[PDB]
Design a protein around this ligand. Structure first.
Ligand code: CL
Ligand code: CL
Ligand code: CL
Ligand code: CL
Ligand code: CL
Ligand code: CL
Ligand code: NA
Ligand code: NA
Length: 130
């Protein structure tokens, strides 16, 4: 599914994302916007290294989920990458939380550094009741 902005903001808030490891809801929203356009079915194959990015947060198969086809990959979220293509985002949120428990935090996603870091991100949550 493709979420609408404020729908997604409240969904993430109910799933415990606001302030998770210091990361505001607006930052999670900015991440989802630029990774996938709020689309849980989004996929991107990286021909350069044979990995794939899955779901609303575009979480990568080399480290975080198992798809069976990424060489030498691990599965730190202990999930099939299929779980990251569901309309319900609970599993994707649990995995994103795992990602940011690592040293880099939200910086794990280059798109966040490019599109969200040191920016005014208020617009992503304005009017949503969060
Ligand atoms: Cl939690
Ligand atoms: Cl916020
Ligand atoms: Cl595995
Ligand atoms: Cl699996
Ligand atoms: Cl920062
Ligand atoms: Cl509001
Ligand atoms: Na599992
Ligand atoms: Na960290």
């Amino acid at each position: 599914k493709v979420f609408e902005r404020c729908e997604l903001a409240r969904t993430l808030k109910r799933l415990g994302m606001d302030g998770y490891r210091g990361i505001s809801l607006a930052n999670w929203m900015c991440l989802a916007k630029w990774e996938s356009g709020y689309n849980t079915r989004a996929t991107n194959y990286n021909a350069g290294d044979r990995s794939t990015d899955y779901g609303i947060f575009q979480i990568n198969s080399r480290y975080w989920c198992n798809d069976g086809k990424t060489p030498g990959a691990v599965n730190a979220c202990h999930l099939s990458c299929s779980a990251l293509l569901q309309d319900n985002i609970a599993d994707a949120v649990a995995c994103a939380k795992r990602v940011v428990r690592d040293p880099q935090g939200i910086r794990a996603w280059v798109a966040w550094r490019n599109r969200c870091q040191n920016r005014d991100v208020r617009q992503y949550v304005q009017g949503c009741g969060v």
